Design a protein around this ligand. Structure first.
Ligand SMILES: [Mg+2]
Ligand SMILES: [Mg+2]
Ligand SMILES: [Mg+2]
Ligand SMILES: [Mg+2]
Ligand SMILES: [Mg+2]
Ligand SMILES: [Mg+2]
Ligand SMILES: [Mg+2]
Ligand SMILES: [Mg+2]
Ligand SMILES: [Mg+2]
Ligand SMILES: [Mg+2]
Ligand SMILES: [Mg+2]
Ligand SMILES: [Mg+2]
Ligand SMILES: [Mg+2]
Ligand SMILES: [Mg+2]
Ligand SMILES: [Mg+2]
Ligand SMILES: [Mg+2]
Ligand SMILES: [Mg+2]
Ligand SMILES: [Mg+2]
Ligand SMILES: [Mg+2]
Ligand SMILES: [Mg+2]
Ligand SMILES: [Mg+2]
Ligand SMILES: [Mg+2]
Ligand SMILES: [Mg+2]
Ligand SMILES: [Mg+2]
Ligand SMILES: [Mg+2]
Ligand SMILES: [Mg+2]
Ligand SMILES: [Mg+2]
Ligand SMILES: [Mg+2]
Ligand SMILES: [Mg+2]
Ligand SMILES: [Mg+2]
Ligand SMILES: [Mg+2]
Ligand SMILES: [Mg+2]
Ligand SMILES: [Mg+2]
Ligand SMILES: [Mg+2]
Ligand SMILES: [Mg+2]
Ligand SMILES: [Mg+2]
Ligand SMILES: [Mg+2]
Ligand SMILES: [Zn+2]
Lengths: 78, 120, 144, 206, 60, 155, 24
RNA sequence: CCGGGCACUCUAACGGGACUGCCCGCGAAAGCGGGAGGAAGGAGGGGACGACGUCUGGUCAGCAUGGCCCUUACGGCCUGGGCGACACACGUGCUACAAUGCCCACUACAAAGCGAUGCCACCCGGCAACGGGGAGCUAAUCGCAAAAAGGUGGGCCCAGUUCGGAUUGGGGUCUGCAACCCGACCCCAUGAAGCCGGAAUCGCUAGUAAUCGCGGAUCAGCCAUGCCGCGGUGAAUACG
RNA sequence: CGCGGGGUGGAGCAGCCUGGUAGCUCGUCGGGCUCAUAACCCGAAGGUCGUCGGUUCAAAUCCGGCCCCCGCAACCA
RNA sequence: UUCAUG
């Protein structure tokens, strides 16, 4: 789906581009799970929000063309 | 005559006989028989061996199949079970993934109903 | 060692919406009597006092090996829940008009006693009797 | 789960629509909003005059808001000024030419929307309930009608059990389409609850 | 929560997907009609009173 | 029905034969409102009849219906203790229905695989006397007439 | 049958159009 | 499609027509059995219609409402999640388990509908969903729209199969700020369970059952196989 | 204190044959029936076969021997 | 004609 957009957020995109300034810190607390893993902007562990708390997914190159909400699983009993 | 892997059909029409090769279904078997150029309704008990290899040169060289495909499907599954994407988890415990309800259904991703349940 | 007990009148009185396997912190000796069956819940539920649940007004016999080490028998014992469950029920008391009654005191594989709490609504089965003749006719004489 | 509404059972025949106008999908919701809001103004604030129905029409920007009142002495005014202020009120919620035609009833007891309101005023005035019912049916028959039935629903007489009392004199043929049984309904909002007065008035048949 | 929501149906300065229509007389958010704008209950009690022109008990 | 006599739906006469047995056979063949396929099946069946046997397209079928037509059929009646299975003789206005329904069931269970040749090989063997439908007739006329012991309940 | 998404009747049951059920 | 034009089918008003009306048999009368004519029969077939009241039936979560309770929160706003979770059980349906069946092509045959920020004809592009132009429609006038089942003649050949289409991977298009929880479709792989079903049980007495599609509602999309309607083909039986 | 006899599904029991092939009733779980529980009907499932060591290719089966349970004796003085 | 109870 979704071939006419980069579908990244006006605050997650700004934060990862500002935190890619020559290498920076690691904390980025997002609430918007809908945004994708910013392609070629991987590396910084993002604290996604399944509702109960912020799970700190360390994003890797095997997870680049996915969304951030896959890594905040919203239920128990896997 | 075997085609790909070892998957040999006999005594059947060729344009569904190709379907027994994994990775070829009904649509690819419709397409890449007249695409090479074969009457797609010749029973493979009588298939000319020159036409068998003129078919096989399109079967193996074009798209990936049983083994090199099957293994990439399984590697996609193992890649999905990575740290915990939501589709690689629930492959990790076999539940369904693309929006299936599981309250009552999902007997083809679960089992054999383990009927250990029930109140008093 | 005791089997499942019974809150007889509460099982046959209050509508059990849902249950919890709660816990009881026994304050030192009231154990073997509850392990032998001495418990009567009549006139008791589990009441909060602004932070936590106490199983109120439960009579258990002081055990007769403690010749003078007895306990005040009908007291408020410190019940056990989880914390989000505890503040959940603390909210739900004022949200829905509940009463929190036990159902049984049953033991687990740790050899511990757990008081199976359950919610109430009342289950209003009490028949408000239809009016007899000698009041309906004087209401009608008022209506004259 | 019974007895469908004897206005809407008749409604196609023997009985007019109380609001009759027209437009398609574009302005039907938008007309109905102001047609409900005009009535929410009137029925809340003209009840002292005892309005029965609000026949609302519009041919093209001529909102005939012709109401049916028993006593227009507090819906017109002495020489007419409450009618004037009420028309400038009806201009405030719809800008159109809101011609408000008050029209009196030919007998204020053959109109079920006012008999039921009168019973509701008796209940909210704390009168005796079945005395009010058997009086209202008798006042309807002395006004002269073929048959009446005033169902007054529960919490009756300040009780706790809620029975429904009713009384009839004459015939009330509900299932007959040609009957022209007028129907009125009015809440009563006293202390012990909501007393729902209904009243059926069997006028001339056919 | 319905006096909030019968005005939340009015106000939209945010996205235009959240313009769910709410009922006019009552405040029901289900079965509200893209015609009249009443819900099915307000539609039934207005069609039976006769405050909707043209509407009628159907039998075909 | 319980009150009245419940008179039977008058059928149509058929087109090519002008007969009333054949239309009830069309109806008993007819699966899920598909009469234009069912009577198609029957006319292919009489074509296979005219191919195989030098007979009429209708005569082998009518004689098959007659030679599958039951007379004594067993009906259950609970008469206290053990529900007896009482024999009774059948009105021909029910014999026709039982006969045609047995023909369709035995023809559909008959081990040929195509539509009208199943009915062809069934009507041939039923007009002969060695078919599954006449086997079922003899089955029910051996249930009754050997279950004759409780026939004194005529009901 | 009809739950299939790649035939004629399987597409007319789902209602939509495709390679298997085209637009004229 | 018009040039001539409305004959008709139709449309939707207004009317008529069917009432034991006729005649016979039975019958105290009501009425019943039959016949004739009629298009129709003995409530012509269906709707709407549901009495006094019961179940202290259901709904304070459609609304209105007495009472009690919350009033820097049990109110209010938002972001995100959930309402979709799953060891199993149940109810209602859908497709199936095939050759009367399935697949491709081609040609027919409906009513009911619904649409100015909508329906989108007809092109171009893309296998396709759809995308870019844009005709017509303020709609018996243009559109959705294809009707499907049927029929035609080509395939399959009793095979878990060209039955089945669940599942899973991949490529995508639309809506929407947003499809990961959780949308719909498209395409290509995948091809499982399932070979007519236990004990039990349900539905149906005529255009009914069965089978087949179509429309609408709500609606951005949609969960739709549901619901509400529409027609196509169209039975068996009711001894009692 | 010494003989001999058992140990098998939640319980009560068949058993298991030189060892390889394990069940019966009730109970259980799910369904069906019923307004609902009974009863009845339908689908399965459940056991380290007293622990332990022994020869055996392999033990529940055969050989010991140890712990609980049963039946016996414990007499002459 | 079987068949126990709320
Ligand atoms: Mg899901
Ligand atoms: Mg006990
Ligand atoms: Mg009492
Ligand atoms: Mg009482
Ligand atoms: Mg007394
Ligand atoms: Mg007061
Ligand atoms: Mg919406
Ligand atoms: Mg017997
Ligand atoms: Mg017959
Ligand atoms: Mg298929
Ligand atoms: Mg065409
Ligand atoms: Mg009729
Ligand atoms: Mg109740
Ligand atoms: Mg209230
Ligand atoms: Mg509530
Ligand atoms: Mg309200
Ligand atoms: Mg709030
Ligand atoms: Mg839900
Ligand atoms: Mg089903
Ligand atoms: Mg098919
Ligand atoms: Mg529409
Ligand atoms: Mg375009
Ligand atoms: Mg139109
Ligand atoms: Mg039309
Ligand atoms: Mg797929
Ligand atoms: Mg079946
Ligand atoms: Mg049975
Ligand atoms: Mg539709
Ligand atoms: Mg739904
Ligand atoms: Mg066993
Ligand atoms: Mg034992
Ligand atoms: Mg059981
Ligand atoms: Mg001695
Ligand atoms: Mg018996
Ligand atoms: Mg008995
Ligand atoms: Mg008893
Ligand atoms: Mg009693
Ligand atoms: Zn409403």
């Amino acid at each position: 789906s979704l071939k006419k957009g980069v579908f990244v957020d006006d605050h997650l995109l700004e934060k990862v581009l500002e935190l890619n300034a020559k290498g920076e810190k690691r904390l980025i607390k997002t609430w918007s799970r809908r945004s994708t893993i910013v392609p070629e902007m991987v590396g910084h562990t993002i604290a996604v929000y399944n509702g109960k708390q912020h799970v700190p997914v360390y994003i890797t190159e095997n997870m680049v063309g996915h969304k951030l909400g896959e890594f905040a699983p919203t239920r128990t009993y896997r | 005559a075997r085609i790909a892997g070892v998957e040999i059909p006999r005594n059947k029409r060729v344009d569904v006989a190709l379907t027994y090769i994994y990775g070829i279904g009904k649509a690819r078997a419709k397409e890449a028989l007249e695409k090479t150029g074969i009457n797609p309704a010749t029973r493979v008990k009588d298939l000319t061996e020159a036409e068998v290899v003129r078919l096989r040169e399109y079967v193996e060289n074009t798209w990936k199949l049983e083994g090199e495909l099957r293994a990439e499907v399984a590697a996609n599954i193992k890649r999905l079970m990575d740290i915990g994407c939501y589709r690689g988890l629930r492959h990790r415990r076999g539940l369904p993934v693309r929006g299936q309800r599981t309250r009552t259904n999902a007997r083809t991703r679960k089992g054999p109903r383990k009927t250990v349940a029930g109140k008093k | 060692m005791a089997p499942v007990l019974e809150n007889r009148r509460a099982r046959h009185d209050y509508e059990i919406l849902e249950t919890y396997e709660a816990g009881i912190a026994l304050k030192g000796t009231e154990v073997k009597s509850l392990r032998a069956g001495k418990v009567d819940f009549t006139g008791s539920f589990a009441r909060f006092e602004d932070g936590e649940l106490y199983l109120e007004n439960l009579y258990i016999a002081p055990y007769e090996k403690g010749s003078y080490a007895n306990v005040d028998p009908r007291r408020k014992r410190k019940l056990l829940l989880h914390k989000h469950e505890l503040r959940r029920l603390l909210g739900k008391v004022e949200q829905k008009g509940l009463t929190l009654v036990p159902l049984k005191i049953y033991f687990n594989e740790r050899g511990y006693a757990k008081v199976l709490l359950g919610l109430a609504r009342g289950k209003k089965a009490y028949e408000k009797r239809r009016e007899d003749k000698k009041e309906a006719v004087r209401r009608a004489l008022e209506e004259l | 789960g019974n007895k469908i509404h004897p206005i809407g059972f008749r409604l196609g025949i023997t009985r007019d629509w109380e609001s009759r106008w027209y437009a398609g999908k574009k302005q039907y919701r938008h007309l109905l909003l102001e047609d409900q809001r005009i009535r929410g103004l009137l029925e809340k604030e003209l009840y002292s005059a005892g309005l029965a129905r609000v026949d609302i029409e519009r041919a093209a920007d001529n909102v005939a808001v012709t109401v049916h009142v028993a006593k227009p002495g507090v819906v017109i005014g002495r020489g007419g000024e409450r009618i004037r202020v009420l028309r400038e009120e009806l201009a405030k919620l719809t800008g159109k030419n809101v011609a408000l035609n008050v029209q009196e009833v030919q007998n204020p007891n053959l109109s079920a929307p006012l008999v039921a309101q009168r019973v509701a005023e008796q209940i909210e005035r704390r009168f005796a309930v079945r005395r009010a019912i058997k009086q209202a049916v008798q006042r309807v028959m002395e006004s002269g009608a073929k048959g009446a039935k005033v169902i007054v629903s529960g919490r009756i007489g300040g009780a706790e059990q809620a029975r429904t009392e009713w009384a009839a004199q004459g015939r009330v043929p509900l299932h007959t389409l040609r009957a022209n049984i007028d129907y009125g309904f009015a809440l009563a909002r006293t202390t012990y609850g909501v007393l729902g007065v209904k009243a059926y008035i069997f006028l001339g048949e056919v | 929560a319905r006096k909030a929501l019968i005005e939340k149906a009015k106000r939209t300065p945010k996205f235009k997907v959240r313009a769910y229509t709410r009922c006019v007389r009552c405040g029901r958010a289900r079965s509200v009609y893209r015609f009249f704008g009443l819900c099915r209950i307000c539609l039934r009690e207005l069609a039976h009173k006769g405050q909707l022109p043209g509407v009628r008990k159907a039998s075909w | 029905a319980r009150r009245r006599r419940a008179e039977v739906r008058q059928l149509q006469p058929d087109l090519v034969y002008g007969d009333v047995l054949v239309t009830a056979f069309i109806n008993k063949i007819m699966r899920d409102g598909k009469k234009n396929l069912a009577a198609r099946i029957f006319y292919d069946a009489c074509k296979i009849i005219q191919e195989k046997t030098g007979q009429e397209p209708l005569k082998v079928f009518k004689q098959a219906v007659e030679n599958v037509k039951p007379r004594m059929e067993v009906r259950s009646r609970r008469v206290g203790g053990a529900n007896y299975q009482v024999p009774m003789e059948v009105s021909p206005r029910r014999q026709q229905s039982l006969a045609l329904r047995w023909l369709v069931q035995a023809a559909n269970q008959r081990p040929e695989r195509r539509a009208a040749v199943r009915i062809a090989h069934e009507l041939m063997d039923a007009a002969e006397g060695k078919g599954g439908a006449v086997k079922k007739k003899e089955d029910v006329e051996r249930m009754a007439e050997a279950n004759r012991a409780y026939a004194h309940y005529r009901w | 049958g009809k739950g299939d998404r790649r035939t004629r009747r399987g597409k007319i049951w789902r209602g939509t159009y495709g390679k298997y059920r085209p637009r004229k």
